[PDB]
Design an enzyme around this catalytic site. Structure first.
Site: not given
Ligand SMILES: O=C(NCC(=O)N1[C@@H](c2cccc(O)c2)CC[C@H]1C(=O)O)[C@@H](S)Cc1ccc(O)cc1
Ligand SMILES: [Zn+2]
Ligand SMILES: *[C@@H]1O[C@H](CO[C@@H]2O[C@@H](C)[C@@H](O)[C@@H](O)[C@@H]2O)[C@@H](O[C@@H]2O[C@H](CO)[C@@H](O[C@@H]3O[C@H](CO[C@H]4O[C@H](CO)[C@@H](O)[C@H](O)[C@@H]4O)[C@@H](O)[C@H](O[C@H]4O[C@H](CO)[C@@H](O)[C@H](O)[C@@H]4O)[C@@H]3O)[C@H](O)[C@H]2NC(C)=O)[C@H](O)[C@H]1NC(C)=O
Ligand SMILES: *[C@@H]1O[C@H](CO)[C@@H](O)[C@H](O)[C@H]1NC(C)=O
Ligand SMILES: [Cl-]
Ligand SMILES: [Cl-]
Length: 586
Positions: A314-315, A344-345, A348, A372, A474, A484
């Site tokens: 997971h990204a 997205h990343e 951050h 986010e 999550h 989100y």
């Molecule tokens: O947000 C994270 N990835 C993105 C993500 O998951 N999403 C976000 C998305 C997905 C695709 C395109 C986007 O523009 C945004 C929103 C949905 C939601 C989803 O996919 O369900 C990491 S940064 C979260 C994390 C992971 C591990 C950790 O230890 C701490 C934080």
């Molecule tokens: Zn994120």
């Protein structure tokens, strides 16, 4: 007295940088190389950082924060008084850490197998099935299989996880873990504010849902789609039906206005994961924002390992709390969806770099949704037909109303469809944490909310032992989700403000802020604040006003709402799911 408080926060900051940097490295190693050894070391670092948190959190609690004059020191000490999991007795802390590790490993290594056949991982294999298959039974196999293997296997851990995370929250002054999570927004009206925003987006979502339901009825058959009921949850192109963009081909408003295959375009033109992150870096620096350091390119994991290593795919983005070392971990695939994730990343990382000079207690986003949203804002401009054409991934689609509505639909399938999903995840978890949902009805209450908010129904009736929330990253990873929902509302507010700052005129959805130094300066001033001020101040710096508001998202999609109402009225759609009790017959 004031002087003792200042010395305390100075000592906290020095020691926290060292300890947190060591923990980050052990966490990185487990995440990029799931083995029994790296697991064991991670758990040892859990206890070392807990010892630090307890030492300093105990000292911080000896300060009567009411008597402190300086508001910044006041704010840091108040935050350090929250020990989080380090408040647990040693026995419970050890159990909690192992629980979290066991849940994360279980989700990450789960597979779905054909009888005497291939075994498929979630990424890329099952996600590809959900995205490209148009066969009801093949989609159902992947949908049910993932929940059978991932979700059902998380259930054995979840009741104990809930008990321990709530125990920690109570020991830090909260009534349960959901109370603790909501407090991160520092907004007493949070639940009412979010409900008001959700209701504002109902016209758009209900009209999109009814339009998609009709298109699914056309493809999958009248016997399998009830035009007045909820949509079967495996038909939306995505394992969790949280984004619907992969069924664009089934719902294209103007099929006479075809669009280039962007994946085949990226692949034909030799795009790579590194190119995707390099393009993101260039967008940020075109705004005058900071480039990622050379170290970033040497230490990040920008694709799935070839050597077979188990990893958390997971990204995610990583701050190592030394002001120099920032990294992304992503099992990147070469397509447009992952190009957005890359931005997205990288948002951050930009936030990390902007607030790196604050004391570590304040090195967070103004609220979790802000963190986010940054990358998503830039990705809105990247996704415009004009920008994609400049990357040679689309043909010139300008000056066509048909192409315009087609593009708005593509964006709606991602952004609008995600709103109710992003709302309900923590509506469910908050009620688990406060005890309104027990393990006897985890799954029943999840599907009640999938129905109420998204208008979806399970293709196969759920049975005792199912734990479908566990099949969503999550949940086993204990990552809050309302961030989100907030992010998806405010990113359009930010887009609208930055487009205005850049001098753009005309429809908001046509704006591309590439190279706007004025847009960059708005974002940088706000990001530099970190968590040092209440988030309305950061909102004000970006948008000229202090509130969360759905008006920008509504403005962006207004031409689509008009088209959808006309289209749905022409076909006599009944919006919503009045026949809410319908579920598939076969
Ligand atoms: O947000 C994270 N990835 C993105 C993500 O998951 N999403 C976000 C998305 C997905 C695709 C395109 C986007 O523009 C945004 C929103 C949905 C939601 C989803 O996919 O369900 C990491 S940064 C979260 C994390 C992971 C591990 C950790 O230890 C701490 C934080
Ligand atoms: Zn994120
Ligand atoms: C309440 O206390 C606040 C915190 O005080 C600090 O922390 C405590 C624990 C003690 O250590 C105390 O000694 C500290 O000062 C306090 O907020 C602080 O206010 C000062 C100004 O009084 C701010 O100073 C500014 O710092 C920036 C840079 O700081 C960071 O970046 C550099 C570069 O990497 C690092 O070396 C630092 O260590 C920091 O990490 C400077 O760039 C800036 O100079 C610019 O502005 C001045 C005008 O102020 C110009 O003359 C220059 O040319 C520059 O353009 C300042 O020197 C400090 O950032 C700020 N800290 C925080 C966290 O907000 C606050 O003032 C107190 N409240 C009251 C009412 O007194
Ligand atoms: C994975 O972890 C094991 C155990 O710590 C270690 O021996 C190995 O070198 C690691 N592999 C990589 C690629 O980091
Ligand atoms: Cl589900
Ligand atoms: Cl959150």
């Amino acid at each position: 007295d004031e002087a003792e408080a200042s010395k305390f926060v100075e000592e906290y900051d020095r020691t926290s940088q060292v300890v947190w940097n060591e923990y980050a490295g052990a966490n990185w190693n487990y995440n990029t190389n799931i083995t029994t050894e790296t697991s064991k070391i991670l758990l040892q670092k859990n206890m070392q950082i807990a010892q630090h948190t307890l030492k300093y959190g105990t000292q911080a609690r000896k300060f009567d924060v009411n008597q402190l004059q300086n508001t910044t020191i006041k704010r840091i000490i108040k935050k350090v008084q929250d020990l989080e999991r380090a408040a647990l007795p040693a026995q419970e802390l050890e159990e909690y850490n192992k629980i979290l590790l066991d849940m994360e490993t279980t989700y990450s290594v789960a597979t779905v197998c054909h009888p005497q056949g291939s075994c498929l991982q979630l990424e890329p294999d099952l996600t590809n099935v959900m995205a490209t298959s148009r066969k009801y039974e093949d989609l159902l196999w992947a949908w049910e299989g993932w929940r059978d293997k991932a979700g059902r296997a998380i259930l054995q851990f979840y009741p104990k996880y809930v008990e321990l995370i709530n125990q920690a929250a109570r020991l830090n002054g909260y009534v349960d873990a959901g109370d603790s999570w909501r407090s991160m927004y520092e907004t007493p009206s949070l639940e009412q504010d979010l409900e008001r925003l959700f209701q504002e987006l109902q016209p758009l979502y209900l009209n999109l849902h009814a339009y998609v339901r009709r298109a699914l009825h056309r493809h999958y058959g009248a016997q399998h789609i009830n035009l007045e009921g909820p949509i079967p949850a495996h038909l939306l192109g995505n394992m969790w039906a949280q984004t619907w963009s992969n069924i664009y081909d089934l719902v294209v408003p103007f099929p006479s206005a075809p669009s280039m295959d962007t994946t085949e375009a990226m692949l034909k033109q030799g795009w790579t994961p590194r190119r995707m992150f390099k393009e993101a870096d260039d967008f940020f620096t075109s705004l005058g924002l900071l480039p990622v350091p050379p170290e970033f390119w040497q230490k990040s994991m920008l694709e799935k390992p070839t050597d077979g290593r188990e990893v958390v795919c997971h990204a995610s983005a990583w701050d190592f709390y030394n002001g120099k070392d920032f990294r992304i971990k992503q099992c990147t695939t070469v397509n447009l969806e992952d190009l957005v994730v890359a931005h997205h990343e990288m948002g951050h990382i930009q936030y990390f770099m902007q607030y790196k000079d604050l004391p570590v207690a304040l090195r967070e986003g103004a609220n979790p949704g802000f963190h986010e949203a940054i990358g998503d804002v830039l990705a809105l401009s990247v996704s415009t037909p004009k920008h994609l054409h400049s990357l040679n991934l689309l043909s010139s689609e300008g000056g066509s109303d048909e192409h315009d509505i087609n593009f708005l639909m593509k964006m709606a399938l991602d952004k609008i469809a995600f709103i109710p999903f992003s709302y309900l995840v923590d509506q469910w978890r908050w009620r688990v944490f406060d005890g309104s949902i027990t393990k006897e009805n985890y799954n029943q209450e999840w599907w009640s909310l999938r129905l109420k908010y998204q208008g979806l129904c399970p293709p196969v009736p759920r049975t005792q032992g199912d734990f479908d929330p566990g099949a969503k990253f999550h949940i086993p990873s204990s990552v809050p989700y309302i961030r989100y929902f907030v992010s998806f509302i405010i990113q359009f507010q930010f887009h609208e403000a930055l487009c205005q700052a850049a001098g753009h005129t005309g429809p908001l959805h046509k704006c591309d802020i590439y190279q706007s130094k004025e847009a960059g300066q708005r974002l940088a001033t706000a990001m530099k604040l970190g968590f040092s001020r209440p988030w309305p101040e950061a909102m004000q710096l970006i948008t000229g006003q202090p509130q969360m508001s759905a008006s920008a998202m509504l403005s962006y999609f207004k031409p689509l709402l008009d088209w959808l109402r006309t289209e749905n009225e022409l076909h006599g759609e009944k919006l919503g799911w009045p026949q809410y009790n319908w579920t598939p017959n076969s």
